[PDB]
Amino acid sequence: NTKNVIRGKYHPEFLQNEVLADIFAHTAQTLPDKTALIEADKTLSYGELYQQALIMAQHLALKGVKPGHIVGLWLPRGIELLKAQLAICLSGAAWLPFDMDTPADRIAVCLEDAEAVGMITTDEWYEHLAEVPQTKWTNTELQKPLSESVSLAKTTPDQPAYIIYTSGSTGKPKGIVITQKNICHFLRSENSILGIQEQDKVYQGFSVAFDMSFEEIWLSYLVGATLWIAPKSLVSDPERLCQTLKQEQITVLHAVPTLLALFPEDVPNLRIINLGGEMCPDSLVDRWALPHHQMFNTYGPTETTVSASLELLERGKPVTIGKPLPNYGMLVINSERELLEQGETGELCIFGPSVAQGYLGRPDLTADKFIENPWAMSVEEELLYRTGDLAKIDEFGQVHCLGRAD
Ligand SMILES: C[As](C)(=O)[O-]
């Protein structure tokens, strides 16, 4: 028995023999006529989005894209960006998302490092990529009519689903490889607690280069909710966003605390508020943890798929990172990879089926940061990711972070 290893709830049913394409295809075939995406006054249904992304995927297959390949993604916020992401997904390949403000040289170095077979962009933005050697396709040319149907090879759970390169890093590139298994499990695990529903209308304001975009997009895809895609102009105007959320009857908001703290008024019809990025300050909890709001705080590194722990915020309750997500787990070690007794301070480590494959093409660093778990109780717990954060375990079984080890 041990009180120095904290586990999320035990839900083995969240580990299915599935890939992202299966989740989306299920939703699209089950709710073909429900609105999936909204961009300004433009709407697209799940069935329409599915068929268009399928045509794009068949075009990708004709150009040589196959399961396991990596395809870049660089488009403006809107419907075409999400459709291109889905097109890459349905072809069986993994996508490399680039923020809208990524410089071309950074795109080049990231595509080279990932050995990407190509990337998708727009006709307008195509001109800005003279220095990129890799093949570049436009969303327009991938949407032309096909003369005959192309069969798409299926990807498998062990294959990559996407690779995250830290947007805004000028240092040597470090690609984090997330597998289909990682992300499918994460989606089911976190939604078992958040509870995004088909009736929800979800704000989509994060760039696809950031983890929380998944919580906006794919959680929605999981249950068939509708996405309202914010334009670039809106993302920098908190008052205007606060009003837009009311006018459009948005019910789910994923955001970071600093953005929420800049809202002048309450947005009463927000069912769910998921705050990632940083721990929520007490004043903001007192301001927004109202009876008609379910206010959450998610913590977790990119290397363990989007999020690793989740806390329900409530007025008067001190803020913590909460407990691990279902089937996730956390423990604490010292400088020499030894399990610490409850109460002692050390490096926080995370395990579970959502621990990433590692860093792309950097096996030394991967082996230094992804280590064997001598205390695993199942095959899904055999890999610890070392967060680099100091932490200790409360006398109440709660993890408390204490800054960085450096
Ligand atoms: C190429 As290396 C030392 O980051 O595994």
Numbering used by the authors: 7 to 412
Task: Show passages lifted from the paper.
Nonribosomal peptide synthetase (NRPS) enzymes, usually composed of condensation, adenylation, and thiolation domains, are involved in peptide natural product biosynthesis to produce antibiotics and siderophores. Activity analyses show that the A. baumannii homolog activates L-Orn and the full-length protein produces isopeptide polymers in vitro. Structures of the isolated adenylation domain from PosA are presented with several diamino acids and biochemical assays identify important substrate binding residues.
To better understand the substrate binding in PosA, we solved four structures of the isolated adenylation domain. All four structures were solved in the same space group P212121 with two protomers per asymmetric unit. Data were collected to 2.2–2.5 Å for all four structures and refined to completion through iterative cycles of model building and refinement. The structure of adenylation domain N-terminal subdomain (Acore) shows the typical acyl-CoA synthetase fold with three subdomains. For other members of this family of adenylate forming enzymes, including several firefly luciferases21,22 and the free-standing adenylation domains BasE23 and VinN24, only the N-terminal or Acore domain of the adenylation domain was observed in the crystal structures; no density was observed for the C-terminal Asub domain.
